[PDB]
Amino acid sequence: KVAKLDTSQWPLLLKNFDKLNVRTTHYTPLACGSNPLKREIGDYIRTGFINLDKPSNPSSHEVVAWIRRILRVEKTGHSGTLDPKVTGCLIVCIERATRLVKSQQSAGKEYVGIVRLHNAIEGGTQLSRALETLTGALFQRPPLIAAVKRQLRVRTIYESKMIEYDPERRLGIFWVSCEAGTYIRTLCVHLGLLLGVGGQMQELRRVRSGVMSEKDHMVTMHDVLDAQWLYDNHKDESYLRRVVYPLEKLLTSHKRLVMKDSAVNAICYGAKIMLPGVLRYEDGIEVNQEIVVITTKGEAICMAIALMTTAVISTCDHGIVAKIKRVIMERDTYPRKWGLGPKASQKKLMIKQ
Amino acid sequence: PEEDVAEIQHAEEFLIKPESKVAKLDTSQWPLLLKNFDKLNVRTTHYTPLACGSNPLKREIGDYIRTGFINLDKPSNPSSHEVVAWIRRILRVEKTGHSGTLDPKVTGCLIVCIERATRLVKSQQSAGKEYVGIVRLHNAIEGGTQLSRALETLTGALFQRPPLRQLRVRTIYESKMIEYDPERRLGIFWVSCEAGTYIRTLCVHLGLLLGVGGQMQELRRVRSGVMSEKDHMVTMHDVLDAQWLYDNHKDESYLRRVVYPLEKLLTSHKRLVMKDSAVNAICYGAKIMLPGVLRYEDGIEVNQEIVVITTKGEAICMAIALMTTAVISTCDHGIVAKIKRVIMERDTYPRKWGLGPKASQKKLMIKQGLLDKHGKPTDSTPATWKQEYVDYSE
Amino acid sequence: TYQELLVNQNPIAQPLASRRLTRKLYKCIKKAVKQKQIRRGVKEVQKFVNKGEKGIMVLAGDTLPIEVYCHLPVMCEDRNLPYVYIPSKTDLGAAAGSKRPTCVIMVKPHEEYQEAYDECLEEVQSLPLP
Amino acid sequence: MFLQYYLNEQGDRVYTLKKFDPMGQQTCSAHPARFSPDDKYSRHRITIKKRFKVLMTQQPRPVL
Amino acid sequence: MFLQYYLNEQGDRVYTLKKFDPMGQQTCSAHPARFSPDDKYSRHRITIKKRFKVLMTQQPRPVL
Amino acid sequence: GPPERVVLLGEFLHPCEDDIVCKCTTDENKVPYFNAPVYLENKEQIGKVDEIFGQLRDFYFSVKLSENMKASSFKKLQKFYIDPYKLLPLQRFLPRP
Amino acid sequence: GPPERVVLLGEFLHPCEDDIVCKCTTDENKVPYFNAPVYLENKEQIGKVDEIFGQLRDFYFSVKLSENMKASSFKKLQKFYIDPYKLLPLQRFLPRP
RNA sequence: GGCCGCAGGAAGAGGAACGGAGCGAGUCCCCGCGGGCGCGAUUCCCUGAGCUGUGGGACGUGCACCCAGGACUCGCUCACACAUG
């Protein structure tokens, strides 16, 4: 029935693959990989992440500690700290997905918080104007830590919105879209100074962490514990495969570069991505741009830096398309198939002869 | 069904299957000078790209502004020199120029070139321009047919004199009557003309030719060469606001709608794609020789103005074609074009001349004393080299 | 005619005054014109609002281009001044005692006509955000 | 705590302080249930979430 | 300033001396707004152009 | 002690919980040091810079007042002055080229 | 880092045992801080003020040179510059009224 | 357009493994993290006007948290790969 599906309904990094530019259509397939969704449950978890809804008591490092007890894994990372009393979207990368943590930690966040004002204001419009004032690149003092005075720094707030105001309790809901490392507690203090009445952040929840949000694919800590239990006691993967998602779901925004099966293992060993191995390449690849390199089965091989643009790839016949930034896939997932090609064979032949 | 699609995604295997059909690209939607890159004639595919420059649209904001221009809608108080001085001050940039002087009270298309795009100002100043003005007649006329007949008469190569110098010739290609108002004796006219045509003078001549007398009430430029008033046109407020938004919100989005790269001005010209090794040579003032041509457009003719571009789509230089398309396809060596105006900076691309096979051969023979220090033949030169090597200095 | 003027309207012309509020505002302007309390045009209104005056700023919803006066709404919100858009430019100039259209006028309060001014001010302060 | 929400017609969370939405239904707490790592009631939650067809495995599968 | 215009079905300016279209609505002035370099209302213009979704960034992207 | 000279730091806006919020108006958009002494034009110390907030080119600051001072004393658009050595250039906070 | 500006400190006289003795020529006869960085007019640090000696209104100073500098490099009557904040007024050292 | 002066060149366009990866350590960056979890007995106390029963506290007691990344630098391992029509 896959034949009936339009390419727009293919999963993850194979979505809309027919609208990539085709360099060559010919290669020799190898029975090595799987589609990222059909990885054996062990491998699926080791290359996966959880879009967690963090609870309101523990610290974010305690939460990811609890996840690595439950799933019985050695490594986890967490897409930016939420403070102990803050809830919401916390991307927890597991094992080999921890290679992506910098891209997740540096992504744009969104928050929904409550500011409590210490005296009455004229109305909801006055709070709405103070939020418009604190849009754009703002000064914010990073809090003191271990008696180390960090200097004043700049963080951008992309959008702000005043959702509701209650004049009785002097409470105001705000929604903020902002750069990573923005202090929302500090924003509420400044919002209080700007109004003149004073203020504090009553409450906070993170509604987005870059690509993932609370809208879809989000799960609670009970689901994580519950899914593992069902696998341990009844040998059922079904629940775990809805809690954990493969790391390819975090990379769907990046520009793609599809490689032949021969090239895959070479790149995993630390070879540069050469042009003879490129099957397909996306529109809008620029120089020094971070791209995802994938297999024909949609598995992420590596995060690579492009040294050719889309147009340059179209004109050339050989050479370095991209250099590695970080290898995702393990060595020897695919077999060694390098040195077999025409020019590489000619080189080795003419050295011997 | 949404759920049926979701079920197939997890059940059945996906694979980009092998095929035997020829790989056909679609470059019709690629930006600027990379549009229809597929349709260029290919001389060779074999070269080493350098990864130094950028696609013109995706330059860093500093480099983007320095290699860019604004299709400005000029406001009605200041002079054209004052307007570009404001833009120079706003963008915090060293040099600025424009595509033709509009008088203080005239509005419309003013292509303000920024920094390294100011190398195109002579080409933009010489380009054909369209105006929409209002002639105010001193006395009444029978009807709008008479004023149209006067514009019909002044279509062609005309005598003109500047406002308050020598007599000058200026062609008006097309002219038209939009409408006429008998009450206030005002008539809107549209004229397409060459650069430096005086529209004040045209309004006086319309007045004399009719017999009633007249002058120019007001004027607006609707076209300046390639750019028009419906093509990406922007106001002084937008320019100020876009810079401010970049300063205060760190948002480049608005600047990139205001400013466009200079390559957008050159989209009409025929393209000659050079190899990355040849790029910096041409920037230093070399001849555009055949060994470095990757691709070349259809319908290049001799003495035609062509744009010479990199593989990334950057403009290197405007150039005069010495060879036809048919000659480039068949010849073994020679000079393909000569430089008219170098656009690209020196050392944008690295300095990679004299590394070739035939160039290295010539350097070796100069070291061996087989050629002279200035690369000229001797009596001792082999007849193979002396016959084959067509020195272009001649 | 009021409903016909909605066809001519400007993208930023909200909150628009109702048919009845438009009528009340014209008569408050005419009374203020007789006492010479109004300020007309962008140049004057911008100067006086910056200088420190307060009142009601009536904007014209037929104004194009918007760049002539689109800075004024935020100038009001900085100083908590009430503002409102009326449908026409030509009607604002006629009410202001001008034979040309006008894009903006600021009506200041006065003891002569506080009843009409208060009816307009409170209704304009009550206007919902778009 | 203070943050509540109700879903709009396209399934997006609409945050609010008020205990009732504009259609008179009760608003949910924005925050998830408090978690313990020493929770031993995994069997119990699966048992009745299966019974009432509200276990995560029984819902429509997400489109990826 | 006498020069006015109304937009055609094609999208281009039709210049005219009259203050109304053939289809009834008002013609816009052909000339752009007066500018002065001392202007310090960039924040103000952007602020409301964002609100009504008429800022140049929020429009459909041009064809290059 | 009292500095040799003082440069314009900013102007008084509304008070806020017994310290004073002030719009910053420095030449070259310079930014004050944290806990930098704030003076009136008579070179008398009124307080110290506590908070710095707002957009980069249009920022505010609160002043934690001295022992003897009260927030009710100051009038609207009253100017405050700072020792020019505990200012920093805006370029420091702007991103690296 | 490098200061925003530098003011005339003094001029080069003879070297003395691998540091340089300099006649002080400050405006208002201001006195430098001990271990205050000494710059050339290019805002490159040559050393630090080690000794200050001589009469109040006609005083000298030695400069302990930087790692890379040599005392032979400097010419006669070559000027040196200091960050104006690590100067002090002469009135401080003059007696109390 | 032309003339003069200064500066950079005096250019035939090269290179189908260049010079990589994965770990480990030291040092920076990141970095608001005594708090979090459980059980026991006088229903262990408590609908406090004090947060709070979808949880707050007292006393016993135990338990698990305080990373993971990136950059630079000096090791170990695996390669030194132009991708088989």
Numbering used by the authors:
A (entry chain G): 43 to 395
B (entry chain C): 23 to 186, 192 to 421
C (entry chain E): 23 to 152
D (entry chain J), E (entry chain F): 1 to 64
F (entry chain H), G (entry chain h): 65 to 161
Sentences from the paper on this structure:
Telomerase is a ribonucleoprotein (RNP), which preserves telomere length by adding telomeric repeats (GGTTAG in humans) to the chromosome 3’ termini. The enzymatic activity of telomerase relies on a telomerase reverse transcriptase (TERT) and an internal RNA template contained in the telomerase RNA (TER or hTR in humans). The human telomerase holoenzyme contains 11 accessory subunits, including histone H2A-H2B dimer, two sets of the H/ACA heterotetramers (dyskerin, NOP10, NHP2 and GAR1) and telomerase Cajal body localization factor, TCAB1 (8, 9). Recent cryo-electron microscopy (cryo-EM) structures revealed the segregation of human telomerase subunits into two lobes flexibly connected by hTR.
However, our cryo-EM structure reveals that dimerization is primarily facilitated by interactions between the two H/ACA RNPs, with the two catalytic cores positioned away from the dimerization interface. In our dimer structure, the two H/ACA RNPs pack against each other through an intricate network of protein-RNA and protein-protein interactions, which rigidifies the RNA linkers in hTR. This limits the relative conformations between the lobes of each protomer. The P4/5 linker of hTR from one protomer binds to a cleft formed by the 5’ dyskerin, 5’ NOP10, and 5’ NHP2 of the other protomer. The P4.2 stem is anchored by residues Lys121 and Arg122 of the 5’ NHP2 and further stabilized by other residues in the 5’ NHP2 (Arg62, Lys65, and Lys69) and NOP10 (Arg34). The junction between the P4.2 and P5 stems (nucleotides 327–330) also engages in backbone interactions with the 5’ dyskerin, specifically with residues Arg158, Arg211, and Arg212. A cluster of previously unaccounted disease mutations in hTR, NOP10, NHP2 and dyskerin is located at the dimerization interface between the 5’ H/ACA proteins and the P4/5 linker of hTR. In particular, NOP10 R34 and dyskerin R158 directly interact with the P4/5 linker. In our dimer structure, we observe clear density corresponding to the two N-terminal RG domains of the two 3’ GAR1, one from each protomer. In our structure, the intertwined N-terminal RG domains of the two 3’ GAR1 make contacts with the P7b stems of the two hTR.
